[PDB]
Design an enzyme around this catalytic site. Structure first.
Site, PDB file in Angstrom:
ATOM      1  N   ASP B 178       0.848  -1.192   0.000  1.00 41.33           N
ATOM      2  CA  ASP B 178       0.000   0.000   0.000  1.00 41.33           C
ATOM      3  C   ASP B 178       0.884   1.242   0.000  1.00 41.33           C
ATOM      4  O   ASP B 178       1.527   1.538   1.007  1.00 41.33           O
ATOM      5  CB  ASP B 178      -0.928  -0.011   1.214  1.00 41.33           C
ATOM      6  CG  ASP B 178      -2.080   0.973   1.085  1.00 41.33           C
ATOM      7  OD1 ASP B 178      -1.954   1.978   0.346  1.00 41.33           O
ATOM      8  OD2 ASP B 178      -3.122   0.732   1.734  1.00 41.33           O
ATOM      9  N   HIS B 270      -9.168  -1.508  -9.029  1.00 42.15           N
ATOM     10  CA  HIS B 270      -9.007  -0.394  -8.145  1.00 42.15           C
ATOM     11  C   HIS B 270      -7.878   0.558  -8.527  1.00 42.15           C
ATOM     12  O   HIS B 270      -8.277   1.841  -8.742  1.00 42.15           O
ATOM     13  CB  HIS B 270      -8.752  -0.863  -6.704  1.00 42.15           C
ATOM     14  CG  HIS B 270      -8.629   0.282  -5.803  1.00 42.15           C
ATOM     15  ND1 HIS B 270      -9.682   1.023  -5.243  1.00 42.15           N
ATOM     16  CD2 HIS B 270      -7.446   0.823  -5.292  1.00 42.15           C
ATOM     17  CE1 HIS B 270      -9.109   1.999  -4.437  1.00 42.15           C
ATOM     18  NE2 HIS B 270      -7.776   1.875  -4.472  1.00 42.15           N
TER      19      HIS B 270
HETATM   20  C1  HEM Z   1      -9.389   0.651   2.672  1.00 35.22           C
HETATM   21  C2  HEM Z   1      -9.453   1.306   1.499  1.00 35.22           C
HETATM   22  C3  HEM Z   1      -8.371   1.174   0.400  1.00 35.22           C
HETATM   23  C4  HEM Z   1      -7.467   0.205   0.175  1.00 35.22           C
HETATM   24  C5  HEM Z   1      -7.277  -1.126   0.941  1.00 35.22           C
HETATM   25  C6  HEM Z   1      -6.669   0.594  -0.978  1.00 35.22           C
HETATM   26  C7  HEM Z   1      -5.643  -0.130  -1.545  1.00 35.22           C
HETATM   27  C8  HEM Z   1      -4.866   0.256  -2.619  1.00 35.22           C
HETATM   28  C9  HEM Z   1      -3.850  -0.561  -3.260  1.00 35.22           C
HETATM   29  C10 HEM Z   1      -3.491  -2.004  -2.821  1.00 35.22           C
HETATM   30  C11 HEM Z   1      -3.314   0.154  -4.262  1.00 35.22           C
HETATM   31  C12 HEM Z   1      -2.194  -0.276  -5.237  1.00 35.22           C
HETATM   32  C13 HEM Z   1      -0.863  -0.083  -4.529  1.00 35.22           C
HETATM   33  C14 HEM Z   1      -0.571   1.405  -4.442  1.00 35.22           C
HETATM   34  O1  HEM Z   1      -0.200   2.002  -5.487  1.00 35.22           O
HETATM   35  O2  HEM Z   1      -0.720   1.992  -3.340  1.00 35.22           O
HETATM   36  C15 HEM Z   1      -3.972   1.444  -4.285  1.00 35.22           C
HETATM   37  C16 HEM Z   1      -3.705   2.468  -5.155  1.00 35.22           C
HETATM   38  C17 HEM Z   1      -4.342   3.688  -5.134  1.00 35.22           C
HETATM   39  N1  HEM Z   1      -5.426   4.052  -4.347  1.00 35.22           N
HETATM   40 FE1  HEM Z   1      -6.400   2.865  -2.955  1.00 35.22          FE
HETATM   41  N2  HEM Z   1      -7.117   1.826  -1.410  1.00 35.22           N
HETATM   42  C18 HEM Z   1      -8.152   2.212  -0.581  1.00 35.22           C
HETATM   43  C19 HEM Z   1      -8.892   3.373  -0.678  1.00 35.22           C
HETATM   44  C20 HEM Z   1      -8.629   4.414  -1.535  1.00 35.22           C
HETATM   45  C21 HEM Z   1      -9.389   5.633  -1.617  1.00 35.22           C
HETATM   46  C22 HEM Z   1     -10.649   6.001  -0.800  1.00 35.22           C
HETATM   47  C23 HEM Z   1      -8.837   6.403  -2.537  1.00 35.22           C
HETATM   48  C24 HEM Z   1      -9.456   7.779  -2.853  1.00 35.22           C
HETATM   49  C25 HEM Z   1      -8.891   8.587  -3.731  1.00 35.22           C
HETATM   50  C26 HEM Z   1      -7.680   5.701  -3.094  1.00 35.22           C
HETATM   51  C27 HEM Z   1      -6.784   6.107  -4.068  1.00 35.22           C
HETATM   52  C28 HEM Z   1      -5.752   5.367  -4.637  1.00 35.22           C
HETATM   53  C29 HEM Z   1      -4.822   5.820  -5.668  1.00 35.22           C
HETATM   54  C30 HEM Z   1      -4.796   7.226  -6.312  1.00 35.22           C
HETATM   55  C31 HEM Z   1      -3.982   4.820  -5.956  1.00 35.22           C
HETATM   56  C32 HEM Z   1      -2.839   4.813  -6.998  1.00 35.22           C
HETATM   57  C33 HEM Z   1      -3.419   4.102  -8.236  1.00 35.22           C
HETATM   58  C34 HEM Z   1      -2.537   4.209  -9.463  1.00 35.22           C
HETATM   59  O3  HEM Z   1      -2.522   5.274 -10.142  1.00 35.22           O
HETATM   60  O4  HEM Z   1      -1.847   3.210  -9.786  1.00 35.22           O
HETATM   61  N3  HEM Z   1      -7.599   4.484  -2.447  1.00 35.22           N
HETATM   62  N4  HEM Z   1      -4.911   1.481  -3.270  1.00 35.22           N
END
Ligand code: HEM
Ligand code: HEM
Lengths: 361, 361
Positions: B178, B270
């Site tokens: 994450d 996601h």
């Molecule tokens: C418990 C809730 C969430 C979990 C478990 C989660 C998990 C993850 C994971 C595993 C990734 C891919 C690894 C990384 O690049 O960090 C990711 C990417 C991302 N997440 Fe979430 N996320 C959550 C909620 C949110 C929320 C509410 C937002 C609101 C904007 C968000 C925005 C993003 C963004 C911008 C990325 C980068 C994606 C990219 O451009 O590759 N996340 N998240």
């Protein structure tokens, strides 16, 4: 080599987590047995939990691990299992309950809450990393849920790894150096004070735990004069030295008097009332700090998870607490026991064995 | 040199705690202003808190510190202060509230609880050591209590220091790596994405925080098939690699298709729904994990303190969340936002100055 890859042996004559130098985080999980959990069921339970600890403490996923990628980086994870007084009645094994394994007697300082007291089964999980710890707790509950209900869960912390050197005394949330006088793992005095040798045979090589959730009345403590704070304990705040000495580990001189003829360490000083002359009778203190929640107007709810290990609750714990229960014990103005539980902690096991097999097998 | 003696500068063009690489522990303190706390009172408040942070972050006692021996070993302690929408009305400074600083619009996934939402004033305290952190929190409440009521306090953690190397991506309580895609402190893209330059002048050099308490429905997550788990995110669980690559930091290829002609990274994955092509428009994610309490039958209450920092809530946060609010977003089956708060975070200060002086002075 890393704080994350470091391990503690799970197998041995003793369970880990007792002689193990306290890790940065702890969860004390208190469980009550479900109506159908008898001797056979407890065997299946302890075999499940044993194997979970066996794998997770070495950085391997538990069987049916829901989050296997959280198994690596064990960070000195240890499990310590304890049996409450009620566990022997449910097991049909009242003959095997140690005589002293029973709720502590009432003390005048007590403000005990049911939600922090008692319990049939303890799972004490300690670890230098809170994410590793959290995963270990979920896995424990995954296998215990069919057999038990969660009575309480108490979470605590010490310094993060690397913040102070190994072995240096750490401070509690009252700012006091806490742990100066303590049986040292791997000494005659420790083994005789901690590991059971008398009583029912199954417990030999085990120990007992007295777990007391003690609130710190920090609002009152803050307003207490600093010289009064040192008078109450018998030691100085910054150095930790006894009032008769200059360095933390100087031996308290309970016979020194001042110019006027008065005891240097006061009659009701906290290290005087709590001191036991015979080291082999002492308790092992292995506490964790807690900090939980604020009221609307900014009162803290914080204190000490006071974990005392001894071979004999009646000989080694109750007299000290009884002696602390006196009126002139000034620390009682600023601390309040709000939870009390006692557990019989079995000996360790090897491969092919399981924790508690000598009792339940 | 030590994890304990290490410090973060308190003074600078920006407040610490934003570009600062996330420390092992965090407390987000949410405060509501008392009936008599207007512009003058907020000035006295911010001057008190500024000096507290100035001393404590460098390992020195705050003025009137009740536990001065808990000041040393600052362990990279930082304070970050934020102003809620209501703070501008109470200050008589509605003209100075950024247009976008207001409760987030409703989302279909929302299950928002008042006890985790809103707030007039944020004190975000981060630190590698939980005892240092606890002391810093008590001192904050000691000086804020006369002016404010505690609305909520959210506590979170990451890995302990030393468990993983610096900069390595850490896992969340769902086991997922994450933080892989994130603006990097000290790049053009970071400064343009994070630090305010337009809008009311006082906020330039500051930022905004969207703080969302997001519960992880781990009981349901556990029963989800692992290949389904990777299909939902767009990345592999162990490696963190995008499904189109082999290593964690490989760039996701949102145009790759498989043998059958179907997108390798699914339409509702996601990382696809959340991706923004223009790096300068991205949000800074700086989350903490939480783990709080067990029910009687062993359900966990754990999740993510999702902390998003951006120069513009309307341009950089709301579109992503709106895009995540779609029906096919499978992560919504296993996560539930239960708290939402927004804050305007002023620029930093030097000696002789104080946090918020450009707004309230
Ligand atoms: C418990 C809730 C969430 C979990 C478990 C989660 C998990 C993850 C994971 C595993 C990734 C891919 C690894 C990384 O690049 O960090 C990711 C990417 C991302 N997440 Fe979430 N996320 C959550 C909620 C949110 C929320 C509410 C937002 C609101 C904007 C968000 C925005 C993003 C963004 C911008 C990325 C980068 C994606 C990219 O451009 O590759 N996340 N998240
Ligand atoms: C929140 C509650 C308590 C606080 C803040 C506290 C604090 C302290 C401090 C500052 C010391 C001296 C430093 C050290 O040697 O560790 C000490 C010693 C000690 N305490 Fe306590 N204590 C508490 C409760 C208890 C309780 C309930 C017991 C019950 C047996 C106990 C038993 C002892 C013992 C045996 C010593 C060693 C004294 C000696 O022989 O020098 N403490 N404690």
């Amino acid at each position: 080599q890393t704080t994350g890859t470091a391990t503690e042996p799970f197998h041995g004559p003793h369970q880990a987590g007792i002689a193990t130098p306290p890790q940065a985080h702890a969860v004390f999980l208190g469980l009550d047995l479900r109506k159908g959990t008898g001797r056979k069921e407890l065997g299946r339970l302890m075999r499940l939990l044993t194997d979970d600890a066996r794998r997770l403490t070495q950085g391997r996923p538990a069987l049916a691990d829901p989050e296997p990628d959280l198994a690596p980086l064990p960070s000195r994870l240890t499990f310590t299992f304890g049996f409450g007084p009620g566990l022997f009645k449910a097991a049909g094994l009242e003959k095997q309950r140690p005589e002293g394994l029973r709720p502590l007697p009432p003390f005048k300082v007590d403000r005990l809450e049911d939600r922090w007291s008692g319990g049939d089964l303890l799972v004490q999980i300690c670890c230098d990393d809170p994410i590793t710890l959290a995963h270990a707790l979920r896995m424990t509950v995954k296998d215990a849920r069919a057999f038990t209900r969660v009575r309480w869960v108490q979470r605590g912390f010490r310094r993060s790894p690397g913040v102070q050197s190994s072995g240096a005394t750490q401070r509690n949330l009252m700012g006091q150096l806490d742990g100066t006088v303590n049986p040292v793992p791997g000494t005659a005095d420790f083994d005789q004070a901690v590991w059971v040798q008398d009583g029912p045979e199954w417990l030999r090589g085990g120990t007992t735990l007295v777990l007391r959730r003690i609130r710190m009345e920090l609002e009152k403590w803050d307003e207490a004069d600093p010289a009064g704070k040192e008078f109450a304990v018998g030691r100085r705040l910054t150095s930790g030295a006894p009032l008769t000495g200059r360095h933390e580990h100087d031996e308290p001189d309970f016979d020194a008097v001042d110019s006027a003829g008065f005891p240097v360490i006061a009659e009701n000083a906290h290290i005087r009332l709590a001191h036991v002359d015979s080291p082999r009778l002492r308790m092992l203190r292995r506490p964790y700090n807690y900090d939980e929640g604020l009221t609307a107007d900014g009162r803290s709810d914080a204190g000490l998870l006071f974990a005392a290990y001894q071979a004999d609750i009646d000989r080694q714990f109750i007299p000290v607490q009884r002696r602390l229960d006196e009126g002139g014990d000034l620390l009682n103005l600023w601390t309040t026991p709000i939870g009390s539980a006692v557990f019989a902690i079995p000996p360790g096991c090897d491969e092919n064995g399981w924790i508690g097999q000598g009792l339940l097998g």
